[PDB]
Design an enzyme around this catalytic site. Structure first.
Site, PDB file in Angstrom:
ATOM      1  N   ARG A  35       3.297   0.650  55.954  1.00  0.00           N
ATOM      2  CA  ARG A  35       3.741   1.532  57.380  1.00  0.00           C
ATOM      3  C   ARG A  35       2.399   2.457  57.262  1.00  0.00           C
ATOM      4  O   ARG A  35       1.937   3.072  58.216  1.00  0.00           O
ATOM      5  CB  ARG A  35       4.889   2.366  57.178  1.00  0.00           C
ATOM      6  CG  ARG A  35       5.822   1.488  57.712  1.00  0.00           C
ATOM      7  CD  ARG A  35       7.156   2.845  58.074  1.00  0.00           C
ATOM      8  NE  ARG A  35       8.440   1.853  59.084  1.00  0.00           N
ATOM      9  CZ  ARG A  35       9.642   1.919  59.217  1.00  0.00           C
ATOM     10  NH1 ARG A  35      10.379   3.142  58.360  1.00  0.00           N
ATOM     11  NH2 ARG A  35      10.415   1.582  59.470  1.00  0.00           N
ATOM     12  N   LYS A  85      22.220   1.733  58.467  1.00  0.00           N
ATOM     13  CA  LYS A  85      22.613   3.675  59.069  1.00  0.00           C
ATOM     14  C   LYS A  85      23.594   2.856  60.290  1.00  0.00           C
ATOM     15  O   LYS A  85      23.211   2.765  61.843  1.00  0.00           O
ATOM     16  CB  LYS A  85      20.966   3.305  60.290  1.00  0.00           C
ATOM     17  CG  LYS A  85      19.757   4.183  58.995  1.00  0.00           C
ATOM     18  CD  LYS A  85      18.565   3.947  60.124  1.00  0.00           C
ATOM     19  CE  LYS A  85      17.498   5.079  59.101  1.00  0.00           C
ATOM     20  NZ  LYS A  85      15.865   5.282  59.321  1.00  0.00           N
ATOM     21  N   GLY A 136      11.718  -0.550  58.380  1.00  0.00           N
ATOM     22  CA  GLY A 136      11.082  -0.090  57.095  1.00  0.00           C
ATOM     23  C   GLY A 136      12.202  -0.885  55.829  1.00  0.00           C
ATOM     24  O   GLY A 136      11.172  -0.791  54.871  1.00  0.00           O
ATOM     25  N   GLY A 175      15.170   0.772  63.877  1.00  0.00           N
ATOM     26  CA  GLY A 175      16.072   0.791  65.141  1.00  0.00           C
ATOM     27  C   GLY A 175      14.733   0.491  66.201  1.00  0.00           C
ATOM     28  O   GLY A 175      14.705   0.060  67.366  1.00  0.00           O
TER      29      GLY A 175
HETATM   30  N1  ACP Z   1      26.837  -2.649  52.637  1.00  0.00           N
HETATM   31  C1  ACP Z   1      26.008  -2.304  52.085  1.00  0.00           C
HETATM   32  N2  ACP Z   1      26.740  -1.594  51.940  1.00  0.00           N
HETATM   33  C2  ACP Z   1      25.431   0.062  51.751  1.00  0.00           C
HETATM   34  N3  ACP Z   1      24.011   0.063  51.976  1.00  0.00           N
HETATM   35  C3  ACP Z   1      24.302  -1.483  52.370  1.00  0.00           C
HETATM   36  C4  ACP Z   1      24.415  -2.417  52.085  1.00  0.00           C
HETATM   37  N4  ACP Z   1      23.895  -3.675  53.084  1.00  0.00           N
HETATM   38  C5  ACP Z   1      22.465  -3.063  52.680  1.00  0.00           C
HETATM   39  N5  ACP Z   1      22.575  -2.070  52.438  1.00  0.00           N
HETATM   40  C6  ACP Z   1      21.072  -1.207  52.350  1.00  0.00           C
HETATM   41  O1  ACP Z   1      20.350  -0.513  53.951  1.00  0.00           O
HETATM   42  C7  ACP Z   1      19.486  -0.073  53.818  1.00  0.00           C
HETATM   43  C8  ACP Z   1      18.446  -0.811  54.368  1.00  0.00           C
HETATM   44  O2  ACP Z   1      18.809  -0.595  55.729  1.00  0.00           O
HETATM   45  P1  ACP Z   1      18.442  -0.003  57.339  1.00  0.00           P
HETATM   46  O3  ACP Z   1      18.608   0.217  58.949  1.00  0.00           O
HETATM   47  O4  ACP Z   1      17.731   1.575  56.486  1.00  0.00           O
HETATM   48  O5  ACP Z   1      17.662  -1.002  57.630  1.00  0.00           O
HETATM   49  P2  ACP Z   1      15.720  -1.426  58.374  1.00  0.00           P
HETATM   50  O6  ACP Z   1      14.919   0.184  57.701  1.00  0.00           O
HETATM   51  O7  ACP Z   1      15.351  -2.258  58.288  1.00  0.00           O
HETATM   52  C9  ACP Z   1      16.214  -0.974  59.495  1.00  0.00           C
HETATM   53  P3  ACP Z   1      15.341   1.147  60.271  1.00  0.00           P
HETATM   54  O8  ACP Z   1      13.912   1.061  59.880  1.00  0.00           O
HETATM   55  O9  ACP Z   1      16.217   2.215  61.150  1.00  0.00           O
HETATM   56  O10 ACP Z   1      15.479   2.849  58.774  1.00  0.00           O
HETATM   57  C10 ACP Z   1      18.652  -0.539  52.234  1.00  0.00           C
HETATM   58  O11 ACP Z   1      18.870   0.330  51.243  1.00  0.00           O
HETATM   59  C11 ACP Z   1      20.467  -1.517  52.002  1.00  0.00           C
HETATM   60  O12 ACP Z   1      20.279  -1.221  49.865  1.00  0.00           O
HETATM   61 MG    MG Z   2      15.670   2.368  56.660  1.00  0.00          MG
END
Ligand code: ACP
Ligand code: MG
Length: 405
Positions: free
Chosen positions: A37, A204, A362, A385
């Site tokens: 990023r 999230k 991210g 998101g």
């Molecule tokens: N079953 C689970 N329980 C808790 N956390 C989990 C999980 N499966 C995945 N995760 C966590 O999800 C996190 C990433 O989620 P996130 O919503 O930030 O995805 P992302 O970054 O691809 C989308 P965004 O850009 O909107 O933040 C990782 O840190 C992972 O450890």
């Molecule tokens: Mg994320």
């Protein structure tokens, strides 16, 4: 951005540029795990410097500190250090983002100055919850830090936050990353190859479950994995989920979302087995569960298991286009990485036979970096998101707030 001011038409010579960027980089322990990023904003930053900008003031959030200073956990200071080697130029870190002392450092800097402010979410007024006259004042303070504004924060463009929609300067321009990402999605979302699969995971859950409704009018299949799956399985299967992530609000619309998927012929793939953990820790004791066994009290599902991986793989084989936002387990920790690595393998294989594969987020982008697949899928986006809100067919508030031409 065909109707908006963009950086290529912004006169920056002799101007101070204040630039919203998405520097919300993942951090494991205390260091940056992925600089994607930060690298992604360099073309806009260098452009400003090469074309005579007096200064560039950079601002971003990191994490969700929810309006309290948390410099111990969520400081942007390490990003400053990263940005130095990536640019070929030093950057000055301030320990705040407003007002008198920052305003002073930004009022009249030496020619060519690159300045990074501290985490905008240390102040409640950025979000601002977690205060009308203070919000206006917070915005006014940010606005003083440059003569012109650039928003290159594609990753945050879905957030109508003060730094994203509230800067009051005459010229507000989208940067080159905003342009690159919007152009890529406009082409890829205009007539998707079908079946079009969305893969939703991550942590999230509150935010992500609220995007499903409108996504169901755009896709032909959806995997609901990672942390989001537990809300659906508890409601639909009466599954015991232990201490797994659960969204009490999203739980209330789960049956309605399933009805709409049925109505629209969207096949929903939920996991059927799990790797469990006795606590949220890299070195937790681990177990195995299925939907039928449930997850024992006090334990949490932190990855899917092999039977879920086979079902995910089946959905991927059917896909001609994929958007994947959110890992399907806690991939940062090896005990809980297998599900995401297996899905990654499958998504790479799909690409190789002509599937259009778009990875967003991210953290999901960090999957690519971890397994060296950044150039083995079609596009790795800086937005997670944000990209899903484009898939929903929405205008992003951070683009909407830019100047019209
Ligand atoms: N079953 C689970 N329980 C808790 N956390 C989990 C999980 N499966 C995945 N995760 C966590 O999800 C996190 C990433 O989620 P996130 O919503 O930030 O995805 P992302 O970054 O691809 C989308 P965004 O850009 O909107 O933040 C990782 O840190 C992972 O450890
Ligand atoms: Mg994320």
């Amino acid at each position: 951005l065909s109707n908006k001011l963009t950086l290529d038409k912004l006169d920056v010579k002799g101007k101070r540029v204040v630039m919203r960027v998405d520097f919300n980089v993942p951090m494991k322990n205390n260091q940056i795990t992925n600089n994607q990023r930060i690298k992604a904003a360099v073309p806009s930053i260098k452009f400003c410097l090469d074309n005579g900008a007096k200064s560039v003031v950079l601002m971003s959030h990191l994490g969700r500190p929810d309006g309290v200073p948390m410099p111990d956990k969520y400081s942007l200071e390490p990003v400053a250090v990263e940005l130095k080697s990536l640019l070929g130029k030093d950057v000055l870190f301030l320990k705040d983002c407003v007002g008198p002392e920052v305003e002073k450092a930004c009022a009249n800097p030496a020619a060519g100055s690159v300045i990074l402010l501290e985490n905008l979410r240390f102040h409640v007024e950025e979000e601002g919850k977690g205060e009308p006259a203070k919000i206006e004042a917070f915005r006014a303070s940010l606005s003083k830090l440059g003569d012109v504004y650039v928003n290159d924060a594609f990753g945050t463009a879905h957030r109508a936050h003060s730094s994203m929609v509230g800067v009051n300067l005459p010229q507000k321009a989208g940067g080159f990353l905003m342009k690159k990402e919007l152009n890529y999605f406009a082409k890829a979302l205009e007539s998707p190859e079908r079946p079009f699969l969305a893969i939703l995971g991550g942590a999230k859950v509150a935010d992500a479950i609220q995007l499903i409704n409108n996504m169901l009018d755009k896709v032909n299949e959806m995997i609901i994995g990672g942390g989001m799956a537990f809300t659906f399985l508890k409601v639909l299967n009466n599954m015991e989920i232990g201490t797994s992530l659960f969204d009490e609000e999203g739980a209330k619309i789960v049956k309605d979302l399933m009805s709409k998927a049925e109505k629209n012929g969207v096949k929903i793939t939920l996991p059927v087995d799990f790797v469990t953990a006795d606590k949220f820790d890299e070195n937790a004791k681990t177990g195995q569960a299925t939907v039928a066994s449930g997850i024992p009290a006090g334990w949490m599902g932190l990855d899917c298991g092999p039977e879920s991986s086979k079902k995910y793989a089946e959905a991927v084989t059917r896909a001609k286009q994929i958007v994947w936002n959110g890992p399907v387990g806690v991939f940062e920790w090896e005990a809980f990485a297998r599900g995401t690595k297996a899905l990654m393998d499958e998504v790479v294989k799909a690409t190789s036979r002509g599937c259009i594969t778009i990875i967003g987020g991210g953290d999901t982008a960090t999957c690519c970096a971890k397994w060296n697949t950044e150039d083995k899928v079609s596009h790795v986006s800086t937005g997670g998101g944000a990209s899903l809100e484009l898939l929903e067919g929405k205008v992003l508030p951070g683009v909407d707030a830019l100047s019209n031409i």
